[PDB]
């Protein structure tokens, strides 16, 4: 064997073991999710409080791309940042040439092709993050999740990291119980809840919650962070539900 020592080598079953090893780094990361809603998308993530000494609210992890796209990811944080920097260059170049802001499906393939390119050669390592991202364009809201292999699809809701299973089950209930749709303000609340539920699988250290959203009606189709009254209102709705 030794098929797993070098990126881009096919094993005899037809797998790239280095990518599968990158997936292990993703599973080891904190939980993050996205919920697609009526006219928008909501992103949230668990930030482990390592120590008293972290400044609350001041280690932001959700990232904006252009003005209409949010990205969150689990795994190696620097890899996620590198991927978002590339996403930003891709969005700028699309807008520069075509004038309109980059459509979400278009943006999803730019990230996909770039991540897939890092499975083509033994001189690079695959990305050690799964990335949840999306926003609002001329055709509505879109949510996407992208793996170290470069695999991505459109999602009704999505989750990754240590609590991906608990979150997935929780997301599935919402999809079954709301076939007409979830509102943006509703989806923010559910997001808080699921991050709290999913924090079960990671309960050594307690955590700080972070949420963001794009909604045609609630944020004018722009990406904004949920802070203040709306954040605390959703923290409380989550607290209520674990008790």
């Amino acid at each position: 064997t030794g098929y797993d020592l070098s990126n881009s080598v096919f094993s005899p079953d037809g797998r790239n073991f280095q990518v599968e090893y990158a997936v292990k780094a993703v599973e080891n990361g904190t939980t993050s999710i996205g919920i697609k809603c009526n006219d928008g998308v909501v992103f949230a993530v668990e930030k482990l409080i390592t120590s008293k000494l972290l400044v609350p609210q001041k280690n932001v992890k959700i990232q904006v791309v252009d003005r209409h796209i949010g990205c969150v990811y689990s795994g190696l944080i620097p890899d996620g940042r590198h991927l978002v920097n590339r996403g930003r260059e891709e969005a700028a170049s699309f807008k520069k040439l075509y004038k309109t802001p980059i459509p979400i499906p278009a943006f999803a393939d730019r990230l996909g092709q770039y991540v897939q390119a890092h499975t083509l050669y033994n001189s690079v390592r695959p990305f050690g993050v799964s990335t949840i991202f999306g926003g609002v364009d001329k055709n509505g809201a879109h949510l996407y999740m992208l793996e170290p292999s470069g695999s991505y699809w459109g999602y009704k809701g999505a989750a990754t990291g240590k609590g991906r299973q608990s979150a997935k089950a929780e997301l599935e209930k919402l999809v079954d119980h709301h076939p007409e749709g979830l509102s943006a303000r509703e989806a923010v609340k559910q997001a808080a809840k699921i991050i709290y539920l999913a924090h079960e699988d990671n309960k050594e250290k307690d955590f700080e919650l972070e949420i963001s959203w794009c909604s045609l009606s609630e944020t004018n189709g722009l990406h904004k962070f949920v802070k203040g009254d709306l954040l605390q209102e959703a923290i409380d709705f989550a607290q209520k539900e674990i008790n």
Partner: protein, 231 residues
């Protein structure tokens, strides 16, 4: 083991061993401490010497009038990274007439270190940095690790036996965070924090290094007779 030959290889559990080994050079590093109030931010660093005939290796580098850092690990790597910061601070000034936000300094360092963890032939940086500064949103302390992870803190420490100072700072949090408008009291708390990490030895006059930046204070470094005030 079979997976630690270079930075471009994941282990079967998703680890990057060359990065983990770079992290290890930090752990063998002499101890340094960072902490801040709402008005100032302070670095304290224990300098190490080669023997009794040698100098005590500098661990504190000024990056701009409002920003600087302390190092633990490979010193040449700190010089490379600090030089990059000097340039980034400088570009912000010349082009935008704008002092670089400590937070951007952090993001820029994370991204610089990250590149060296995903490509063949390069190696990760083998040094950890504590970055203090005073910008348009006040005092800041940052912890840089060569994995690329950068973190904003009220206080922290890195190097050998930095665990003591870090627990102390964890207890002391509510005290030092409000040493506003008082330079010498933030320092003394920093010097106290670092003392929780000494063994066989204590802080002398050619051994201790302190820096401060804040509201009406340029980043300045004290060594020699100017630290005697503090022992």
């Amino acid at each position: 083991n079979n997976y630690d030959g270079d930075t471009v290889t994941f282990s079967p559990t998703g680890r990057l061993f060359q990065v983990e080994y770079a992290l290890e050079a930090i752990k063998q590093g002499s101890v340094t401490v960072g902490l801040r109030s709402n008005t100032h931010a302070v670095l304290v660093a224990l300098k190490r010497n080669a023997d009794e005939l040698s100098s005590y290796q500098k661990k504190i580098i000024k990056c701009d009038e409002h920003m600087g850092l302390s190092l633990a690990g490979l010193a040449p790597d700190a010089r490379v990274l600090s030089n990059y910061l000097r340039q980034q601070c400088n570009y912000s000034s010349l082009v935008f007439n704008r002092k670089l936000a400590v937070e951007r300094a952090g993001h820029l360092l994370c991204d610089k270190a990250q590149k060296n963890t995903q490509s063949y032939g390069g190696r990760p940086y083998g040094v950890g940095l504590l970055i203090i500064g005073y910008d348009k949103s006040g005092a800041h302390l940052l912890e840089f690790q060569p994995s690329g992870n950068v973190t904003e803190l009220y206080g922290t420490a890195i190097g050998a036996r930095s665990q003591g100072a870090k627990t102390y700072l964890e207890r002391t949090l509510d005290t030092f965070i409000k040493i506003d408008g008082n330079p010498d009291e933030l320092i003394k708390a920093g010097v106290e924090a670092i003392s929780q990490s000494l063994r066989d030895e204590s802080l002398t006059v050619d051994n201790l290094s302190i820096a401060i930046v804040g509201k009406d204070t340029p980043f300045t470094i004290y060594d020699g007779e100017a630290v005697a005030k503090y022992i």
